[PDB]
């Protein structure tokens, strides 16, 4: 049951936009809402509006009086001397709650005229006509006007609706909540050479009487929220999908072949999401818009998605096809379960984010294989076991503070840190995988189909929300639908992993009792760490003995420590028979390293990742080597690679080398075995016999049979030896001499890989392989032996580093004439120049990176150069570079770059709270408090980034370096 927090119900909204002026960056328009009051004596009506100048408001064609105030413009007063962050977080939460449409509130308060009170008490319709104007919007909407001359279509000027969650208040007045569903009528009067893309279906396109402008009329009969309404106006090249004909793809001019190749996969994503769920795609059209200077890499609205143009690749670009493919896939998953089925509160957001991430993981499983699914699930779980042990924990479904271990309030999406938002979505889809583990996948897809079917029977009624609230899901409704389809309720699992905000830590060690033939496990939990919680459920453990692989369920109550499980025979060591594996197959194992008295080959605690856990198991090194070689699970091979770094014995070198030589191993395991072999090789110097590690293996796999030092000409058509070939010198460059210097046998090998590179024969580009070669050249740089702080000049350069510097100069200059796909070699060469500057080789001068961080460059070059400037101002304690970065945060045209500068200055801070630095003035505290209070008031993501930066630099209490 859904009861509105608003005293009115909104039925229909007309959004008309005229006079989109690109020179002056200005729009004019009106908005006409059709509300039905649910309570008599409505009097004031409270709507949401930011940055719009409200000209006049007429209610039922009668002139009404409005008052506007935004408490989130300046959160605390300018003349308050408070400088602690808990004060700002409480004041910011109160300010966002005072404009919240999820309460009754709002920023624009319109007073109902007196003569309509007899029209409002007996509950009859009210039609509110606001007309507004955006004069020059800051972050309200995306504006991109290039400085080439010509007409606005000839220079490539486009508009996007930027922002996240409820950010539609930034460009027209609305009820900007996900719970106020209404039908829509959208008119946009644009230039005759431009096209206006928006939500709904385009019913017509009429000309103006001078035929210089045309009006696009859109209609949206599926009741969506105001927060799902978007807009993209530009000179877009239109491409109808040749497979599905209601899907149109819009790109920027001159990028039509890239659009043709890139969006050619999307029909398979549509077919997948419509056959695992049994509902068809709910909207009547689908539109993909590719734009410049995007807010996020992929945004999903109702019947529309806005991607950045940096996803567009051609047919000869690999290492970008899977990333763009999965961006399209998660936009479509959010089309199904973020835009059609919406949110009932700010709680129950974990339901939608979990269903979106879970069905996108099912797509990844079918498309890229289970191996890639398991690797992705493990990397998401490690991300969580790192973030939650780092700071507190992520609390899905809080109850309204519920989480007081973090420096922000979790009551609203616009007060969350961006890393918390990312980890929120990550934990939501892992908890949905856990619900699939308890209640099987076909019942899970039946739950999702029942939600979609209730929403689509709801979506066709005309009753103003008598039935339109069946399109809003809640937690209680989701659990009730689960209990309807399965008969089991998941309330212990919901109580543990949703309502409780923690992950578990397992420390395991075994001992084999030879007398009674049992395996005595010893599993203890660390439940006193700040991020942890105590697990009391069951726990699966998989033991591989000589007779095969056996699963055991252990009951781990609070007082439990020793778990005795039984062991089988050892009669497959009496005769040589094959040892049967986890799957149905069996292999020949070399049992010379195994103990004579124990049959068990390896043990895995929680193999299926059925809890949110971090396992620290103490096996013997031969058990880790057997688990690396003969396991049929990629996460166990990865964890054995990760655990073999502590055992540098030559049997582990043989194990990793046998993994590296082995095709029919998953390629991301071999790419990890490269770096593990490099670390082991560095640890057993003065024992290593022959050549450096992986060199003979590289010449055996990727070089000519007649010439060992000449590499084969590039043929990248295998896509697994391509990735292994481009990752093996990067790990090989981490080899170190006894003298702690990279050997001149590996550096010469990398330089010969660079010289003899011929790419005139493959059908694929070479930009990522050459960029990884520059990364391998940067990995070999050891710190220089400066004497008496000698100035680093050209004559006293290292003889090794002169070759590296010549190569990166040649590569960067050749990129200036023949550019790569996304300037990958510019990014790699800037990163390598920063590596050479971090050691004492090149003079520590930020002027090159400051010239590459200007506005007109590509955004990857810009963020690489700004990363180099952030690293410089951390190491050299530069005041003027920090003022340069803070000025670039305040006034840069691209808001993604501002968010990225705040993000990089949070990750690599110039000082922490423990450090005494010269940069801890009262002036810097006043600048960052002014940046939290004012200055970042237009983005909701810069303000949370400024809160994160103030927390990283000065902590939760009063800045110490202050009177």
């Amino acid at each position: 049951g859904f009861e509105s927090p608003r005293p009115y119900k909104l039925t229909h909204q007309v959004v008309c936009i005229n006079n989109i002026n690109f020179q002056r960056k200005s729009v004019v328009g009106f908005v006409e809402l059709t509300i039905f009051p649910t309570v008599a004596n409505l009097n004031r009506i409270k709507l949401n509006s930011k940055q719009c100048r409200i000209y006049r408001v007429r209610i039922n064609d009668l002139e009404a009086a409005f008052i506007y105030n935004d408490p989130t413009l300046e959160v605390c007063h300018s003349e308050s001397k408070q400088r602690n962050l808990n004060y700002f977080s409480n004041a910011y939460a109160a300010a966002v709650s005072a404009v919240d449409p999820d309460a009754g509130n709002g920023e624009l308060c319109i007073k109902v005229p007196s003569e309509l009170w007899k029209h409002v008490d007996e509950l009859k319709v009210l039609k509110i006509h606001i007309n507004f104007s955006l004069d020059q919007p800051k972050g309200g909407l995306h504006f991109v006007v290039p400085s080439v001359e010509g007409s606005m279509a000839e220079r490539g000027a486009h508009v996007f609706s930027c922002g996240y969650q409820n950010s539609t208040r930034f460009w027209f007045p609305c009820v900007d909540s996900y719970s106020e569903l209404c039908t829509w009528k959208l008119e946009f009067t644009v230039d005759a050479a431009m096209v206006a893309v928006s939500n709904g279906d385009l019913v017509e396109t009429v000309y103006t009487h001078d035929m210089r402008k045309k009006t696009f009329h859109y209609m949206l009969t599926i009741p969506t929220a105001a927060s799902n309404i978007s807009l993209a106006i530009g000179p877009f090249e239109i491409l109808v999908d040749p497979y599905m004909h209601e899907v149109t793809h819009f790109c920027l001019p001159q990028l039509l072949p890239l659009l043709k190749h890139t969006t050619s996969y999307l029909h398979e994503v549509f077919e997948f999401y419509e056959e695992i769920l049994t509902c068809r795609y709910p909207y009547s059209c689908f539109k993909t818009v590719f734009i410049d200077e995007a807010y996020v890499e992929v945004a999903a609205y109702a019947s529309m998605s806005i991607f950045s143009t940096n996803l567009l690749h051609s047919a000869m670009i690999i290492d970008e096809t899977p990333l763009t493919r999965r961006c399209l896939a998660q936009s479509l998953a959010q089309q199904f379960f973020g835009c059609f089925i919406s949110r009932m509160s700010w709680s129950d957001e974990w339901v939608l984010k979990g269903i979106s991430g879970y069905i996108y993981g099912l797509w990844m499983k079918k498309t890229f294989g289970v191996n890639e699914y398991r690797h992705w699930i493990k990397e998401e779980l490690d991300k969580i076991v790192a973030y939650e042990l780092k700071t507190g924990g992520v609390l899905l479904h809080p109850i309204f503070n519920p989480a007081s271990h973090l420096h922000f309030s979790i009551k609203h999406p616009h007060t969350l840190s961006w890393e918390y938002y990312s980890m929120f979505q990550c934990k939501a889809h892992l908890v949905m995988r856990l619900i699939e583990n308890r209640i099987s996948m076909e019942f899970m897809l039946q739950v999702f189909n029942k939600l979609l079917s209730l929403a689509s029977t709801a979506s066709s009624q005309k009753f103003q929300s008598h039935m339109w609230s069946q399109m809003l899901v809640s937690t209680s409704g989701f659990l009730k639908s689960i209990s309807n389809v399965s008969g089991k309720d998941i309330q212990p699992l919901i109580k543990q992993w949703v309502d409780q905000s923690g992950v578990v830590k397992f420390y395991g060690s075994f001992a084999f009792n030879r007398k009674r033939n049992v395996l005595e496990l010893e599993i203890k939990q660390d439940y006193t760490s700040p991020g942890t919680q105590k697990y009391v459920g069951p726990l699966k453990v998989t033991v591989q003995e000589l007779d095969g692989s056996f699963n055991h369920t252990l009951q781990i109550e609070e007082n439990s420590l020793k778990h005795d499980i039984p062991c089988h025979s050892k009669s497959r060591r009496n005769k040589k028979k094959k040892i049967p594996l986890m799957n149905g197959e069996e292999v020949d194992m070399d049992l010379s390293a195994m103990d004579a008295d124990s049959p068990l080959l390896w043990i895995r605690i929680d193999p299926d990742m059925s809890v949110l856990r971090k396992v620290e198991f103490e096996q013997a090194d031969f058990m880790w080597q057997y688990q690396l070689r003969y396991e049929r699970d990629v996460v166990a091979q990865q964890e054995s690679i990760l655990a073999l770094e502590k055992f540098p014995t030559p049997a582990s070198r043989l194990a990793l080398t046998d993994i590296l030589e082995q095709e029919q191993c998953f390629y991301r395991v071999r790419m990890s075995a490269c770096f593990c072999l490099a670390k082991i090789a560095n640890s057993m110097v003065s024992t290593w016999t022959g050549p450096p590690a992986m060199k003979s293996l590289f010449t055996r796999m990727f070089c000519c049979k007649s010439c060992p030092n000449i590499v084969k000409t590039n043929n990248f058509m295998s896509f697994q030896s391509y990735f292994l070939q481009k990752t093996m010198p990067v790990a090989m460059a981490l080899l170190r001499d006894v003298h702690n210097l990279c050997p001149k046998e590996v550096l010469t090998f990398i330089l010969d890989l660079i010289k003899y590179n011929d790419n005139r024969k493959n059908k694929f580009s070479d930009n990522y392989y050459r960029a990884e070669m520059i990364d391998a050249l940067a990995n070999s740089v050891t710190p220089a032996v400066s004497v008496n702080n000698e100035v680093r000049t050209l004559d006293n350069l290292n003889p090794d580093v002169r070759l590296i510097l010549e190569e990166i100069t040649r590569f960067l200059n050749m990129e200036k004439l023949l550019p790569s796909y996304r300037h990958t070699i510019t990014v790699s060469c800037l990163r390598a120049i920063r590596v050479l500057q971090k050691n004492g080789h090149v003079p520590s001068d930020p002027a090159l990176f400051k010239s590459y961080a200007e506005y007109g460059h590509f955004v990857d070059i810009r963020i690489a150069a700004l990363e180099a400037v952030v690293d410089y101002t951390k190491v050299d304690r530069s005041y003027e570079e920090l003022q340069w970065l803070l000025n670039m945060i305040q006034n840069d045209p691209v808001p993604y770059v501002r968010h990225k500068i705040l993000n990089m200055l949070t990750k690599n801070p110039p000082f922490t709270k423990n450090m005494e630095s010269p940069l801890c003035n009262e002036a810097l505290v006043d600048q960052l408090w002014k940046l939290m209070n004012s200055g970042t008031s237009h983005d909701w993501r810069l303000r949370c980034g400024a809160v994160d930066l103030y927390f990283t630099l000065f902590g939760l209490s009063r800045p110490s370096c202050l009177p």
Partner: peptide, 13 residues
């Protein structure tokens, strides 16, 4: 850019 998981040798059905 493709499957690259040798699935017919690990899971034959």
């Amino acid at each position: 850019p493709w499957n690259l998981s040798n699935d017919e040798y690990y899971y034959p059905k």
